[PDB]
């Protein structure tokens, strides 16, 4: 009567207490570490084939490529089975503020938006995260506001590295173009997907500037309360066509910020900037930390 029931797991010899389901192929659970008091998000991936163990290894490995404040770290990885049930587990830090998306809905539901100083700090954090990814030779490939957590100091943190791959891809011939086009149709949220990945051309080079387009959409989302192709998506018409055609000057935004958004959302990737240039442009605006 003085004891109480609980459900727990052991990971790397440490006991974690189930608290609640956080969300979702995979579940995510809120758990509490009983050694240290801290909270974690335990992502559990269901395996039916060897490929599934392999895909989860891959993701775990992407996380441990980096030790950067704007990139979600991996606390532990493991494999668990019981009878026929087989799972792979990624233990991760818990961000009580949730995602950048639900912060920009919270405001848009009261009629407000993020201020320009808030926008500039967030954007700086996201670019520095990407810069670290690009410098190692990868691209994220599924950047969007629901893949961006907000830390306890308000810092933005990138998550979901299960579509990350080599940054540079040479497409030669229709067969390679089409296999790439199908891969993106699978792994790159359609309304945040770069133009060059619809109708992949037979001879071309797809590089990490793919992420700079997606980042432009995230910026747009922060500035207008929705993604630039969400009404199109939600009203059933063709995103692929909208994305291949081509922002308002709402006087809550400096033209400097408006120029940043325009440059990111250029359709020809050859005319689109790389992250190091964007950071140079951003840091000259001398963005303030929150406080
Ligand atoms: Cl085994």
Looking at the structure, tell me whether residues 50 and 161 fall in a common domain. Answer: no
Looking at the structure, tell me whether residues 79 and 16 fall in a common domain. Answer: yes
Distances (CA, A) of 141 to 109, 137, 151, 208, 254: 29, 13, 22, 8, 29
How many residues does the structure list for the chain? 291
Question: Structural domain of residue 169, as residue ranges?
Answer: 96-291
Looking at the structure, tell me whether residues 107 and 86 fall in a common domain. Answer: no
Give residue 50 CA to ligand 1 midpoint distance, Å: 10
Task: Tell me whether residue 36 is one of the annotated catalytic residues.
Answer: no
Looking at the structure, tell me whether residues 90 and 100 fall in a common domain. Answer: no
Looking at the structure, tell me whether residues 206 and 84 fall in a common domain. Answer: no
Alpha carbons 282 and 180: distance in angstroms, whole number = 32
Looking at the structure, tell me whether residues 55 and 159 fall in a common domain. Answer: no
Looking at the structure, tell me whether residues 63 and 108 fall in a common domain. Answer: no
Last residue of a domain, one of 43, 78, 95: 95
Looking at the structure, tell me whether residues 120 and 15 fall in a common domain. Answer: no
If one counts the domains in the chain, the total is 2
Domain with 287 in it: what CATH number?
A: 1.10.510.10
Contact call for residues 75 and 55 (beta carbons, < 8 A): no
Looking at the structure, tell me whether residues 130 and 219 fall in a common domain. Answer: yes
Instruction: Name the β-bridge partners of 171.
Output: 204
Give residue 73 CA to ligand 1 midpoint distance, Å: 26
Give residue 86 CA to ligand 1 midpoint distance, Å: 10
- Three-state secondary structure readout of the chain: CCCCCCCEEEECCEEEEEEEEEECCEEEEEEEECCCCCEEEEEEEEECCHHHHHHHHHHHHHHHCCCCCCECCCCEEEEEEECCEEEEEEEEECCCCCEHHHHHHHHHCCCCCCCHHHHHHHHHHHHHHHHHHHHCCEECCCCCHHHEEECCCCCEEECCCCCCEECCEEEECHHHHHHHHHHHHHHCCHHHCCHHHCCCCCEEEECCHHHHHHHHHHHHHHHHCCCCCHHHHHCCCCHHHHHHCCCCCCCCCCHHHHHHHHHHCCCCHHHCCCHHHHHHHHHHCCCCCCC
- What number of other Cβ atoms are within 10 A of residue 269's Cβ? 19
- Choosing from 142, 160, 207, 211, the catalytic residue is 142
Last residue of a domain, one of 66, 95, 124: 95
Looking at the structure, tell me whether residues 91 and 112 fall in a common domain. Answer: no
Domain with 74 in it: what CATH number?
A: 3.30.200.20
Give residue 79 CA to ligand 1 midpoint distance, Å: 9
Distances (CA, A) of 260 to 96, 143, 169, 223, 257: 30, 17, 26, 12, 5
Residue positions forming the annotated binding site: 22-28, 43
Give residue 80 CA to ligand 1 midpoint distance, Å: 10
Last residue of a domain, one of 55, 74, 95: 95
Looking at the structure, tell me whether residues 100 and 68 fall in a common domain. Answer: no
Alpha carbons 249 and 255: distance in angstroms, whole number = 8
Minimal CA–CA distance to 159: which of 78, 22, 59? 59
In angstroms, this model's resolution equals 2.6
Residue positions forming the annotated binding site for ATP: 22-28, 43
Alpha carbons 57 and 51: distance in angstroms, whole number = 10
Looking at the structure, tell me whether residues 55 and 118 fall in a common domain. Answer: no
Give residue 47 CA to ligand 1 midpoint distance, Å: 12
Give residue 13 CA to ligand 1 midpoint distance, Å: 19
């Amino acid at each position: 009567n003085l004891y109480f029931q609980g459900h727990m797991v052991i990971i790397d010899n440490k006991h974690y207490l189930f608290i609640q389901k956080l969300g979702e192929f995979s579940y995510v659970d809120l758990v509490e570490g009983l050694h240290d008091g801290h909270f974690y998000a335990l992502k559990r991936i269901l395996c039916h084939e060897q490929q599934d163990r392999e895909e989860a290894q891959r993701e775990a490995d992407m996380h441990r490529l980096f030790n950067h404040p704007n990139i979600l770290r991996l606390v532990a990885y493991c494999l668990r089975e019981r009878g026929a049930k087989h799972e792979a587990w990624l233990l991760l830090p818990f961000f009580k503020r949730g995602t950048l998306w639900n912060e920009i809905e919270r405001l848009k539901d009261k009629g407000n938006f993020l201020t320009e100083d808030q926008i500039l700090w967030l954007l700086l954090g996201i670019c520095r995260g990407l810069e670290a990814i690009h410098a190692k030779g990868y691209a994220h490939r599924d950047l969007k506001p629901t893949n961006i957590l907000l830390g306890d100091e308000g810092q933005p943190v990138l998550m979901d590295l299960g579509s990350m791959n080599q940054a540079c891809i040479h497409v030669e011939g229709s067969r390679q173009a089409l296999t790439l086009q199908d891969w993106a149709a699978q792994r790159c949220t359609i309304s945040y997907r770069a133009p060059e990945l619809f109708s992949v051309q037979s001879h071309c080079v797809i590089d990490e500037r793919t992420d700079v387009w997606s980042l432009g959409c995230v910026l747009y989302a922060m500035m207008f309360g929705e993604g630039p192709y969400d009404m199109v998506f939600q009203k059933g018409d063709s995103v692929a066509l909208a994305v291949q055609n081509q922002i308002p000057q709402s006087p809550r935004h400096s033209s400097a910020l408006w120029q940043l958004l325009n440059s990111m959302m250029t359709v020809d990737p050859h005319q689109r900037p790389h992250i190091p240039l964007l950071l140079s442009q951003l840091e000259a605006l001398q963005p303030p930390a929150p406080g």
